[PDB]
Design a protein around this ligand. Structure first.
Ligand SMILES: *[C@@H]1O[C@H](CO)[C@@H](O[C@@H]2O[C@H](CO)[C@@H](O[C@@H]3O[C@H](CO[C@H]4O[C@H](CO)[C@@H](O)[C@H](O[C@H]5O[C@H](CO)[C@@H](O)[C@H](O)[C@@H]5O)[C@@H]4O)[C@@H](O)[C@H](O[C@H]4O[C@H](CO)[C@@H](O)[C@H](O)[C@@H]4O[C@H]4O[C@H](CO)[C@@H](O)[C@H](O)[C@@H]4O)[C@@H]3O)[C@H](O)[C@H]2NC(C)=O)[C@H](O)[C@H]1NC(C)=O
Ligand SMILES: *[C@@H]1O[C@H](CO)[C@@H](O[C@@H]2O[C@H](CO)[C@@H](O[C@@H]3O[C@H](CO[C@H]4O[C@H](CO)[C@@H](O)[C@H](O[C@H]5O[C@H](CO)[C@@H](O)[C@H](O)[C@@H]5O)[C@@H]4O)[C@@H](O)[C@H](O[C@H]4O[C@H](CO)[C@@H](O)[C@H](O)[C@@H]4O[C@H]4O[C@H](CO)[C@@H](O)[C@H](O)[C@@H]4O)[C@@H]3O)[C@H](O)[C@H]2NC(C)=O)[C@H](O)[C@H]1NC(C)=O
Ligand SMILES: *[C@@H]1O[C@H](CO)[C@@H](O[C@@H]2O[C@H](CO)[C@@H](O[C@@H]3O[C@H](CO[C@H]4O[C@H](CO)[C@@H](O)[C@H](O)[C@@H]4O)[C@@H](O)[C@H](O[C@H]4O[C@H](CO)[C@@H](O)[C@H](O)[C@@H]4O)[C@@H]3O)[C@H](O)[C@H]2NC(C)=O)[C@H](O)[C@H]1NC(C)=O
Ligand SMILES: *[C@@H]1O[C@H](CO)[C@@H](O[C@@H]2O[C@H](CO)[C@@H](O[C@@H]3O[C@H](CO)[C@@H](O)[C@H](O[C@H]4O[C@H](CO)[C@@H](O)[C@H](O)[C@@H]4O)[C@@H]3O)[C@H](O)[C@H]2NC(C)=O)[C@H](O)[C@H]1NC(C)=O
Ligand SMILES: *[C@@H]1O[C@H](CO)[C@@H](O[C@@H]2O[C@H](CO)[C@@H](O[C@@H]3O[C@H](CO)[C@@H](O)[C@H](O)[C@@H]3O)[C@H](O)[C@H]2NC(C)=O)[C@H](O)[C@H]1NC(C)=O
Ligand SMILES: *[C@@H]1O[C@H](CO)[C@@H](O[C@@H]2O[C@H](CO)[C@@H](O[C@@H]3O[C@H](CO)[C@@H](O)[C@H](O)[C@@H]3O)[C@H](O)[C@H]2NC(C)=O)[C@H](O)[C@H]1NC(C)=O
Lengths: 582, 579
């Protein structure tokens, strides 16, 4: 994007705002951030739950100065729970209105366990069991762990373990499972509060045990489906029941699991993919292998995606009569529908503009004038999420300006690459060109590259590349110039490097390190034993050109690295020293 | 006390109410119980915070029919915490008004820890340390326990342990104490909620020389504690020394009661379970150490909330009869007695010539139909109060029998028995028992009579069978009741099964011959080891024996023949071994 200096008339641009999913602690005061720039002093106003939000009628809510940030303070009283809901910020000035994202403000709660009286569980020895937890809801979901009601630890293993939902599955119940009662505990993220379910008590009955084929406990049926969004974590689970404790092995149709992202958890009963993508979609099956038999359960994984920018709409900097366009393209599954708004008002009912023609996801401005100076908003949305973007159209008439300091100085060593910065601005976007030493030929093509923001990269510097560089930005209203002096220094090169050698114990070894460098530079040389900095000690002599070691033994054996560095350059030399044995 | 039947006119009486300290869950609907009786069906009203509580103006509050029990519903909205306060119930009818205890409705609290940023504690090795917990107050009091932030347990011993206040004391800090971080935790059983304090981090510094012991928790040479009668007395002494000192507990001029005194917290705490006025005195603790010994004295005084010596009972009188209401409560300090008539102070009550008050006793002389009312006694000291309702009833009904006529009670020979003969009379009737028209009153050996009219027979012989007559008499007349007591012969197993050793494939038999009374249903069962029988499968249950065929390893054990009837039980045990 291209910004506009603040001295020039400008529609508001939102700088900082709260996150979409704004979860808060039930103790702290609450802050809904909304800050925005604008050449005329921008005024802010809010909407809570799609209706106007009057700050003046609520004493706890106050708005910061020169911004729209709201602070709600509970020192006088009140509780944050009553402020949950969707909030939207609006930043206005005489030239237009910019919108923020919809802040879904929720407070992280720790609700108690619903009062329930649990009867003593009775089960046959060797039978499968499921103790459902059913934890209270929290934001984020609380961490579920099982303990005795006396808070002694329950040991989980391949035979008895909990799923992601929290329920505790016993593949086959044993007598020893009566050693403890099973109470579910939920730990909440922001308060670290634990809520405890009533404890379960088991009563096992002995046989009058016979073996049994595996059977699936958690994923009922032969097949199942899951839907996970792009970039989220995919968590599949398979729980089996069998008298000989089954072993769960995961496989994928037509492909192996990605080694860099897939991980096994919960004793190979859980498979987690970290950063899922369209490629991760498919058919994942799990085998509950056992001494008696083996059965398979299949899972159809479809990966959808919330919209993400391919081309985000950028501000339109225009001169009167110049043609431009706003392009708003997001990608996602399903394909995101584009909705256009002008100053927070739907485009279908906005004040008509003859210069403005809308088509699909693109707005075209032909012969733009001082009118239609407004902030357009694009909302690209699908069932799984939205993307909201602000882009203003600014029609102005100012000559080109230079934004950086004049006659800068940049030093660089010979073969390095470098970048000269020359940011600029003009009412119609001025064209920028670089010249060297008063040459009429502009610098572009081989070895040179010009970026949109005016900076020039030299990819491989020659000694001839030293000198004065002038960047010139020009439009019909005039031109501006800027100067930067590039100085090529001589490279720091180690022309006598330490050589690998094999020495018998007691000898004196010398590793030479002679370096040439630019005289107008502070060169510092250091040594590294193996790959860590070497401490200079007794029997070690660090000359300016070498490093000598007296009475070598087994400890001195290894790799020595001479490092010669100046403020702009670095050079490494690595040698190996072996020490024989007798 | 003496109850009055509901068909006779009587002032109201409070049957059920909430506790004085009524803690409620913040989720459930609130229920403030107050139920009463009265022959004219009583009406009910409430006072919240000593002023009238208007149920009509509140749509959440509703009063149950035929009672004063309030139900506060929060489905439409609201929170229980906004109904906290003092609630008194008044049960009224044409004959008087009865009061309930003041109900202090409070909602339970499991408060979070305030947002705090704890500095890393730094301490010299061997120095004393106190990690303060300081939990925000909650109802009821939470159980404090220390734990790592990763929820690993913290090991307590003689050197490092926590006091009753919850602070963790280190008599001398060691280098190993940096192995884990220290986080306080409060557990609330009423809501099942654990609140975790931010963890402390320890950083010890090494410079150890020895040091004499010094007291940490009970500062100074002497302190004072006051404990209420019936509660637990907990004394704590924490000492600090370079050699970890040992605390020893003693009492001046007396030995600790072995039945009530307990040493807790590695002998750093003394607990008296059921304290009394005798346990009050001087308890001292020695912090013995290799370097020195120091004593801390604690003066324990035992005060008492009021407890009834004589609880005021309902006065049941006839016109022209004299009676008294006695309200005696013992407590330290001595409880002050305050009398009320129909919930109105006796000073401002309408004067009555028959009633004369004196200290804690009210005397009625020449009682008439007038002045029938419910009197309240409130005996209070700074530690607590006792509230009691008792009404004066003036009726003229003859004695009435409250049980069924011609009752039948059956019992085995040597069981103890009890015959119930509930009665009532306008003047309190004298009750008497007789047998088979022997005329002599039944009392003394083998017989006991209770205040409510019941008759207990301790040992029953075969001669005690027959008809028993209960006679309740007063100046207005007499009533009688008949109970037929039938003694049955005890069920005895006279041929018991004997232990035996029998090999495979042998028809084994365990005999169990039972003699019972012919007019009784006999049920004979068997028990393998200690579980009930399974009938069938190569096991034949005869009426007087049991036979098992194809004996194996499962048959070896202990059999139990059980012979039972409606009134009797008999057990016989044998051991069977199989080759
Ligand atoms: C850009 O365009 C998009 C699409 O057009 C807009 O997104 C729309 O936003 C509106 C308003 O926020 C949504 O309507 C709301 O839907 C709530 C239920 O949503 C859940 O179910 C739907 C399916 O029915 C799912 O699509 C949602 O999932 C999406 O969102 C979640 C996160 O929230 C993501 O994780 C998903 O991936 C999806 O992205 C949800 O699962 C519904 O509850 C809500 O109704 C409440 O709010 C309105 C006012 O907004 C009240 O009128 C109403 O009475 C409800 O309020 C009650 O409850 C609250 C407390 O809960 C009380 O405070 C109130 O007093 C009252 O009692 C509303 O209907 C709409 O669903 C969504 N579009 C889609 C396709 O989902 C973007 O907003 C837009 N962006 C900008 C900047 O304009
Ligand atoms: C039989 O007789 C006895 C003795 O006459 C009566 O006992 C008295 O009862 C009254 C009424 O409840 C008490 O008056 C109240 O006192 C409150 C302060 O007392 C507290 O502090 C003192 C020290 O200053 C302690 O000694 C007390 O502790 C003792 O008692 C409690 C039980 O109450 C025990 O648990 C202890 O172990 C001690 O034994 C107390 O802790 C005082 O706050 C209160 O005044 C509030 O309420 C009235 C209306 O009720 C308002 O007018 C007033 O403005 C106050 O209101 C504010 O505070 C309350 C909370 O307190 C909030 O809810 C309000 O919204 C508002 O913010 C009142 O004055 C008296 O203390 C007590 N005396 C004794 C010795 O126990 C029996 O009730 C009586 N029985 C019957 C059935 O009638
Ligand atoms: C092309 O040009 C670039 C830029 O000129 C060169 O990259 C520079 O290389 C030099 C030398 O290798 C770097 O100088 C060294 O930087 C180290 C990192 O410091 C940064 O990061 C730390 C946090 O890690 C920050 O706190 C700090 O503010 C810096 O931002 C320093 O640790 C070095 O300190 C000491 O190093 C030696 C001794 O080891 C001494 O001689 C030094 O004088 C100094 O006391 C040192 O400062 C420099 O940071 C690099 N800049 C960038 C932008 O990368 C390329 O090497 C060059 N390419 C070529 C020649 O091929
Ligand atoms: C003295 O009197 C006491 C008081 O009655 C008496 O104790 C009670 O005995 C009866 C009868 O034996 C018990 O009733 C039993 O209760 C158990 C449950 O606890 C039931 O399972 C029993 O049913 C079995 O036994 C019946 C006996 O006839 C069978 O008819 C029936 O089919 C079942 O097999 C039976 O109802 C009662 O439980 C006890 N009291 C208590 C508190 O347990 C006592 O036995 C008398 N004798 C002596 C010597 O004390
Ligand atoms: C004009 O545009 C160019 C191209 O985008 C900008 O060059 C880029 O500048 C950024 C910030 O200085 C560089 O990021 C840096 O990357 C290094 C890793 O190499 C990291 O250590 C730094 O902390 C920093 O993030 C980026 O590499 C650089 N890109 C190139 C190709 O040089 C330039 O800054 C813009 N100029 C102006 C005035 O906006
Ligand atoms: C008249 O007063 C006597 C004296 O208390 C009453 O006898 C007592 O009655 C109670 C209630 O039935 C008995 O308690 C019961 O004990 C059994 C055996 O332990 C227990 O299982 C029950 O749950 C209950 O607690 C008590 O034992 C008994 N006392 C004696 C000495 O027999 C009698 O009931 C009163 N009569 C009336 C009509 O109220």
């Amino acid at each position: 994007s291209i910004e506009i200096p603040m001295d020039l008339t400008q529609p508001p641009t939102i700088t900082k705002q709260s996150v979409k999913d704004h979860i808060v602690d039930p103790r702290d005061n609450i802050l809904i951030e909304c800050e925005a720039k604008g050449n005329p002093a921008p005024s802010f106003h809010w909407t809570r739950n799609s209706r106007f939000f009057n700050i003046a009628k609520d004493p706890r809510v106050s708005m910061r100065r020169r911004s729209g940030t709201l602070v709600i303070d509970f020192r006088s009283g009140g509780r944050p729970e009553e402020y949950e809901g969707e909030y939207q910020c609006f930043a206005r000035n005489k030239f237009g209105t910019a919108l923020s994202n919809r802040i879904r403000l929720q407070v992280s709660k720790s609700p108690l366990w619903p009062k329930e009286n649990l009867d003593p569980v009775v089960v046959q020895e060797g039978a499968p069991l499921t103790l459902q937890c059913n934890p209270p809801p929290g934001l984020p979901s609380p961490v579920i762990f099982w303990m005795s009601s006396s808070m002694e630890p329950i040991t989980q293993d391949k035979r008895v373990s909990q799923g992601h939902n929290g329920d505790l599955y016993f593949s086959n119940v044993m007598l020893q499972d009566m050693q403890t009662d099973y109470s579910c505990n939920a730990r909440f993220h922001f308060t670290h509060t634990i809520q405890q379910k009533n404890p379960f008590t088991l009563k096992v009955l002995t046989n009058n045990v016979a073996e049994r084929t595996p059977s699936f406990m958690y994923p009922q049926g032969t097949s199942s489906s899951q839907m996970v969004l792009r970039g989220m974590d995919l968590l599949l689970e398979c729980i089996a029941s069998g008298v000989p404790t089954p072993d769960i092995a995961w496989y994928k149709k037509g492909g192996d699991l990605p080694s860099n992202k897939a991980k096994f958890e919960n004793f190979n009963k859980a498979l987690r993919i970290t950063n899922v993508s369209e490629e991760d979609s498919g058919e994942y099956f799990c085998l509950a292998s056992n001494k008696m038999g083996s059965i398979r359960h299949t899972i159809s994984v479809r990966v959808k995606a919330a919209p993400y920018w391919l081309d985000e709409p950028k501000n339109l900097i225009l001169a009167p009569g110049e043609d431009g366009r706003l392009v708003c393209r997001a990608n996602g599954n399903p394909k995101p529908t584009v909705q256009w708004m002008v100053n927070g008002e739907p485009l279908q009912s906005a004040p008509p503009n003859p210069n403005r023609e809308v088509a699909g996801d693109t707005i075209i401005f032909r012969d733009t004038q001082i009118s239609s100076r407004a902030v357009y908003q694009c909302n690209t949305s699908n069932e799984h999420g939205y993307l909201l973007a602000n882009a203003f159209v600014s029609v102005l008439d100012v000559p080109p300006r230079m934004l950086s300091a004049r006659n800068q100085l940049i030093r660089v060593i010979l073969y390095n690459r470098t970048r000269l910065d020359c940011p600029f601005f003009g009412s119609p976007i001025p064209t920028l060109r670089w010249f060297k030493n008063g040459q009429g030929s502009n610098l572009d093509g081989g070895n040179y590259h010009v970026y949109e923001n005016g900076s020039l990269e030299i990819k491989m510097i020659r000694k001839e590349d030293q000198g004065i560089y002038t960047c010139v930005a020009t439009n019909i209203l005039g031109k501006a110039e800027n100067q930067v002096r590039l100085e090529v220094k001589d490279p720091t090169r180690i022309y006598r490097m330490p050589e690998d050698q094999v020495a018998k114990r007691g000898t004196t070894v010398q590793l030479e390190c002679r370096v040439k460098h630019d005289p107008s530079l502070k060169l510092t040389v250091s040594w590294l034993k193996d790959d860590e900095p070497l401490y200079i000690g007794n029997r070690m002599k660090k000359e300016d050109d070498s490093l000598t070691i007296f009475g070598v033994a087994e400890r001195d054996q290894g790799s020595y690295t001479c490092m010669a560095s100046t403020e702009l350059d670095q050079d490494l030399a690595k040698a190996y020293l072996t020490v024989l044995a007798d």
